[PDB]
Amino acid sequence: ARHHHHHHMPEGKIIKALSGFYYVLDESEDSDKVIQCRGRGIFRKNKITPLVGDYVVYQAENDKEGYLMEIKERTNELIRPPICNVDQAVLVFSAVQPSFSTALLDRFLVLVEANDIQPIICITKMDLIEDQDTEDTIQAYAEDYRNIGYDVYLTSSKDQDSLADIIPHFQDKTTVFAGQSGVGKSSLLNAISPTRHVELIHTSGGLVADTPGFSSLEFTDIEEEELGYTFPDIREKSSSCKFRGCLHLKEPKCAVKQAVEDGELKQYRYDHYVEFMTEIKDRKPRY
Numbered sequence: 001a002r003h004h005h006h007h008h009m010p011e012g013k014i015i016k017a018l019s020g021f022y023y024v025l026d027e028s029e030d031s032d033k034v035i036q037c038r039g040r041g042i043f044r045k046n047k048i049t050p051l052v053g054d055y056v057v058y059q060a061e062n063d064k065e066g067y068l069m070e071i072k073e074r075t076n077e078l079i080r081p082p083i084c085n086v087d088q089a090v091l092v093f094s095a096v097q098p099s100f101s102t103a104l105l106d107r108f109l110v111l112v113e114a115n116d117i118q119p120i121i122c123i124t125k126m127d128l129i130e131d132q133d134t135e136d137t138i139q140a141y142a143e144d145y146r147n148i149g150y151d152v153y154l155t156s157s158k159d160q161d162s163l164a165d166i167i168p169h170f171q172d173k174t175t176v177f178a179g180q181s182g183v184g185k186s187s188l189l190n191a192i193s194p195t196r197h198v199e200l201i202h203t204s205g206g207l208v209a210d211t212p213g214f215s216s217l218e219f220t221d222i223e224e225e226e227l228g229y230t231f232p233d234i235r236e237k238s239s240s241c242k243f244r245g246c247l248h249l250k251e252p253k254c255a256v257k258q259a260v261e262d263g264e265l266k267q268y269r270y271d272h273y274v275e276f277m278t279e280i281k282d283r284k285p286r287y
């Protein structure tokens with residue numbers, strides 16, 4: 001028979017943090033159990049605030065609140081919402097209503113990439129396209145981003161609500177939704193179907209944040225030499241640039257610029273790179 005279950009140091013993930021308690025999901029036993037914990041019974045001197053998404057060691061006894069013992073090193077941390085250890089971001093945009101913008105997509109991609117997160121791309125409202133030229137343009141963009149190496153899912157509004165092709169990605173990951181406010185929120189609600197503080201919702205074998213990420217798109221923490229790494233296409237071509245640390249702006253014998261000339265890198269990707277570079281540089285005085 002089962003006895004003394006509570007005399008070990010189990011591990012779990014913080015899925016909710018509210019009013020002085022931390023709710024820890026523990027999948028490591030036949031049970032799916034959520035344990036209400038205080039952060040205080042050990043974990044100091046160590047003033048670090050626990051965050052939703054933290055991987056923790058905790059202790060808990062029968063019919064008593066638990067206590068966080070140790071917070072594991074964080075792989076990443078978002079500021080708004082305050083969450084950490086995020087594996088993936090589903091970036092949701094509309095094909096029409098409003099018209100799809102590679103500029104907007106590329107900005108979100110940079111932010112996700114710069115936070116050590118894997119982007120997944122979702123273009124919805126495909127059902128609202130009547131013009132064949134509009135359909136062809138969106139299919140071409142989708143193939144472009146697939147060729148860069150992203151997963152790209154084209155969905156109808158009242159259909160994508162099912163999230164059929166996205167759901168498989170949730171398993172054993174922590175995921176956030178971001179992108180356009182309208183479609184991003186509606187897709188997210190669809191995902192987690194059966195200010196407030198963010199929670200992770202346990203669904204389809206993984207965790208999904210109940211608040212959109214990346215609500216502000218400033219590049220404040222990104223430096224000029226770091227930007228190219230967030231464009232996998234530019235990043236890979238940068239190996240062939242003559243000068244080391246080439247920023248792919250006015251340098252001669254730049255492989256990135258040559259690739260754009262040849263059609264090996266999309267013109268719009270490079271155009272956005274240069275635009276974002278300018279924005280980064282404009283933070284500071286120039287000499």
Ligand code: IUM
Pocket residue numbers: 116
């Ligand atoms: O996974 U990293 O820098």
Ligand code: IUM
Pocket residue numbers: none
């Ligand atoms: O996960 U890395 O370069």
Ligand code: IUM
Pocket residue numbers: 113117118119229230231232
């Ligand atoms: O997920 U990336 O370069």
Ligand code: IUM
Pocket residue numbers: 118
């Ligand atoms: O996950 U990466 O370069």
Ligand code: IUM
Pocket residue numbers: 232
């Ligand atoms: O997943 U990658 O470069």
Ligand code: IUM
Pocket residue numbers: none
């Ligand atoms: O899997 U790769 O660049």
Ligand code: IUM
Pocket residue numbers: none
């Ligand atoms: O998995 U890779 O760069």
Ligand SMILES: [Ca+2]
Pocket residue numbers: 103275
């Ligand atoms: Ca622009």
Ligand SMILES: [Ca+2]
Pocket residue numbers: 151152
């Ligand atoms: Ca896929």
Ligand SMILES: [Ca+2]
Pocket residue numbers: 199
């Ligand atoms: Ca709740």
Ligand SMILES: [Ca+2]
Pocket residue numbers: 235236
């Ligand atoms: Ca590389």
Ligand SMILES: [Zn+2]
Pocket residue numbers: 238241246247248249251253254255256257
């Ligand atoms: Zn270059």
